């Protein structure tokens, strides 16, 4: 029932959806473009994971306007989802410490 945990879970499922949609749409956006490397779905999912975690190796990246806009959506969704998990951990710790000191 606690809001922070349900929001964390929601953010997790939303992130999975964004990774899958970003993989699909990045391929869709990049295949028009000579030299583009983000053009098959298995490595595009890998790219979407590294973009969502900000763990970005430089092995793949978009070169088109629409692929970069897809990238921005994946970045913000990833950073926001992990920040939400952090915030829920803090809420849990704060509650448990209020209990441990009897408040």
């Amino acid at each position: 029932s606690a809001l922070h945990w349900r929001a964390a879970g929601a953010a997790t499922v939303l992130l999975v959806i964004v990774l899958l949609a970003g993989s699909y749409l990045a391929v869709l956006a990049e295949r028009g473009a000579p030299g583009a490397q983000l053009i098959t779905y298995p490595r595009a999912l890998w790219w979407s994971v590294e973009t969502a975690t900000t763990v970005c190796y430089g092995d793949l990246y978009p070169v088109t306007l629409w692929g970069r806009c897809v990238a921005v959506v994946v970045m913000v969704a990833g950073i926001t989802s992990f920040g939400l998990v952090t915030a829920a951990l803090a809420t849990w710790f704060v509650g448990r410490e209020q209990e441990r000191r009897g408040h």
Partner: antibody, heavy 118, light 108 residues
Framework: QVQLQQPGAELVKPGASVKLSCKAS????????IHWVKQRPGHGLEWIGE????????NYNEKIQKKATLTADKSSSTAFMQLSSLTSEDSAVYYC???????????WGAGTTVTVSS | DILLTQSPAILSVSPGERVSFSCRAS??????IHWYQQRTNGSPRLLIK???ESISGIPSRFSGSGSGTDFTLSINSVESEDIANYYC?????????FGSGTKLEIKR
């Protein structure tokens, strides 16, 4: 069952146009691309373009004159290539092929021999 | 756009021999090379994907190797049904491109 079905032949007068078809069976997925490849007698394979039926977007070989226009019909699982204003340079076998979005042509149609003649 | 050079354009071998086809990419493309066989009057047929991975229903004498710019398709003990044109194809960068093809000939 044969995965991609195309007609054996089409006869086209110079300057006219023709719509080739490629009917797909077997598993279909949202990540499927249909490619078209041109082969002139005694020569190699030349990539023409691709279409993703699930979304309808098509891309074309930039290095050659655009004579193709690719479409797809999801209800009939059929991909089409409209070749426009053909000359004898356009006589060839045109293959379709299916790529599961992982970069290789898993399966090819039997090819349509197009002859441009009066 | 990535040029794939297949040289020599014709390979002549004796039955039972091991033969090797060469494909060189104009830039580094990892293992994103695929090989097709086309017999006379036939449509192309995938033999090897991603430089070395087997395809179901392809005789085991076919193998592939290489990474980067240099790729080899090998046949152990050539036989008659292997007489064909052999093409490589890259999927590393848009657009996909094909090599110009190597014909296999048998000296009987």
């Amino acid at each position: 069952q044969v995965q991609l079905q195309q007609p054996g032949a089409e006869l086209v007068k110079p300057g006219a146009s023709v719509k080739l078809s490629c009917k797909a069976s077997g598993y279909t997925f949202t990540s499927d691309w249909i490619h078209w490849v041109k082969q002139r007698p005694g020569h190699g394979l030349e990539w023409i373009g691709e279409i993703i039926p699930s979304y309808g977007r098509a891309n074309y070989n930039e290095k050659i004159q655009k004579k193709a226009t690719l479409t797809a019909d999801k209800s009939s699982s059929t991909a089409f290539m409209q070749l426009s204003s053909l000359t004898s340079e356009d006589s060839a076998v045109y293959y379709c092929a299916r790529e599961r979005g992982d970069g290789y042509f898993a399966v090819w149609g039997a090819g349509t021999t197009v002859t441009v003649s009066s | 756009d990535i040029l794939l050079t297949q040289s020599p354009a014709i390979l002549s071998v004796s039955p039972g021999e091991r033969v090797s086809f060469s494909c060189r990419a104009s830039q580094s493309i990892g293992t994103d090379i695929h090989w097709y066989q086309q017999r006379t009057n036939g449509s192309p047929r995938l033999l090897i994907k991603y430089a070395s991975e087997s395809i179901s229903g392809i005789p085991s004498r076919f193998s592939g190797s290489g990474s980067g710019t240099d790729f080899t398709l090998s046949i152990n003990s050539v036989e008659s049904e292997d007489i064909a044109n052999y093409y490589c194809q890259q999927s590393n960068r848009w657009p996909f491109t094909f090599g110009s093809g190597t014909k296999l000939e048998i000296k009987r």
